């Protein structure tokens, strides 16, 4: 209920303005606690594709953060094969209820743009990023174009 | 000027800690590791419904002279 | 007196009444229920053999720390050998003690070397990062599999994971297809049978008929007490908006603390003026920052918001009869049902653990309750319980008791037995309540006799158990032949984190 009310207000700000990075926002009409949308990266190796994410808001939102999940596959140190992301803003550690989904997505775009080999989820890749970057960008570029969604207009 | 504090598990025996209010929360969690063998990364401390962050001191949270703290187990997730 | 370097405590290292040195191999962090999940799932193992740098903090291998321990023994021997001028010809047997530890700790260090290269061909140990998240070594699996006191349980969350880490869970039930195991990776595919499914489809049906959860909580009472001084068309607005709010907060704060200290005095210092990070609760914050309320909002929503914003969640549980009532008022979504379906399952799993560790029954309760009409019935009883506001735990114990013969029990569970399960359930379940995933848990009972221990907040087995299993027995121990046996003869499987020296 309260979470839903807060989520409707957030939605109105986006219908009014909106984020260029986060498009096609579709939501569960019934509850608003599940969103789907598309994020379009701007820097290689991901300029060639776009990705579907799912946002799940806890019933207790906003006192508890949402979580993000890539539904499109992606080649990235901080992203799970399963699509899960550790993203500092959502960390239970850091989370502030004042934060809006808008900022979370901005953080996500930033994470995608600038991989962080520090607490990475795929060390297998995290190492190939630190060293031998050139093939990595090849690999990611191909993975993106093969398993990645097509870009908008 | 060094204090005696109490620390309570949700369902097991209260214990006692020799400290002074300069001490870090992190430090409290280590004197607990000392008494109980519980690693600090498994410890979540609450004081009168306010959660304590690792870095701040006892004086920050207004804790002194026989305060009764709530200890609770913490999951550890990557 | 002489400075002694040998530390009363070392990682993984325990010494019994008879100066015997046991090295305990950590399966997972925890005491009774495992606390690691996601990218930490296998840390304690990884760190044991290869050390660890995460958060940029150095953590030394077991091998490394035994080397470190050994040097401090070696120094502690030289500083007594040096002192033979005033020597008693013995140090009250302290030297005897201190050299015994050296002979043992040196056998341990051989053994570690021996697993890395001669008996590590299978690479069970050498499995880190190969599979995404590493699987438990075969020796560990064998050890866990035969355990009399530690047990895994697998459950049925609506949105389950494909792979499971524990291969022989005591409690186990039917699950859907994981979304990650579908061509599109978008959603799980649901099965239409078993415990998990009847629970979810009963508690929140396709008709979308919410299921009421009728119980007054301490919080519910405080709300009504405070609302009893307002009228239904009171609001927060005018230029006196701000002041009215501070009245509301101050009233709320007193009545809350008044009801709280009745049973826990710790909360007399409880304030509601700040959030946890120091931010004054005011009209700006809750209306413009948060957007949870506004001038038009009723006083109720004003109260709930303040409480949500200010009170740590522990405050509500310590004051509650069970995890079943988390303060929600109705089951109104598939998600709500999932959470409750899990509660119920986890409670059975705990009942199933009690009965196993106490030698009441060898059954998988999950298999029983998956079967119709038990699946359908138990869901029905539970939906009912939430409505009448009756306690949920005994509906499960009542059902289990109606079927004790089938479940492998000589006789129904006492109300005492029942309570032990409720105490364990509540402690454990509350601990893992915020887990990222509810596919499985690993619960252990170090008060019982068996092959699994608790040491320094690690759910652990004996390094020699594992060693012997891994090398298929081909390498014998020498003087560590019955260290393993000795430890299980010890009066407890729950081990002190320090050693005795003097």
Author numbering:
A (entry chain B): 1 to 153
B (entry chain C): -1 to 76
C (entry chain A): 8 to 509
What's the paper's own text on this?
The Legionella effector protein SidC and its paralog SdcA have been shown to be required for the recruitment of ER proteins and ubiquitin signals to the LCV during an infection. Our previous work has further shown that the SidC and SdcA are bona fide Ub E3 ligases. Although SidC has no sequence or structural homology to any other E3s, the catalytic SNL domain of SidC contains two lobes, a smaller INS lobe that mediates the binding with E2 and a larger main lobe that carries the catalytic cysteine. To gain insight into the molecular basis of the ubiquitination reaction catalyzed by SidC/SdcA, we determined crystal structures of two SidC/SdcA complexes: a binary complex of the SNL domain of SdcA with the E2 UbcH5C and a ternary complex of the SNL domain of SidC with the E2 UbcH7 covalently linked to ubiquitin (UbcH7~Ub).
To overcome the labile nature of a thioester bond, the catalytic cysteines of both UbcH5C and UbcH7 were mutated to lysine to form an E2~Ub complex linked by a stable isopeptide bond. In addition, to enhance the stability of the E3s, the catalytic cysteines of SidC (C46) and SdcA (C45) were mutated to alanine. Although the crystals diffracted poorly with the conventional flash-frozen cryoprotection method, the crystals diffracted to 2.9 Å when cryo-cooled under high-pressure. The SidC-UbcH7~Ub complex has a more globular, compact structure. UbcH7 interacts with both the main and INS lobes of the SNL domain. The Ub moiety is tightly clamped between the INS and main lobes, filling the space under the ‘arch’. Remarkably, the distance between the two Cα atoms of the catalytic residues of the E2 (C86K) and the E3 (C46A) is reduced to ~9 Å (from ~80 Å in the binary complex) and the C-terminal carbonyl group of the donor Ub is within attacking distance from the modeled sulfhydryl group of C46A on SidC. This dramatic structural rearrangement is mainly caused by a swinging motion made by the E2-binding INS lobe. Notably, the C-terminal tail of the donor Ub adopts a β-strand conformation and pairs in parallel with a short β-strand upstream of the catalytic cysteine. Strikingly, R74 of the donor Ub forms a bidentate salt bridge with the highly conserved SidC D43 and a salt bridge with another conserved aspartic residue D51.
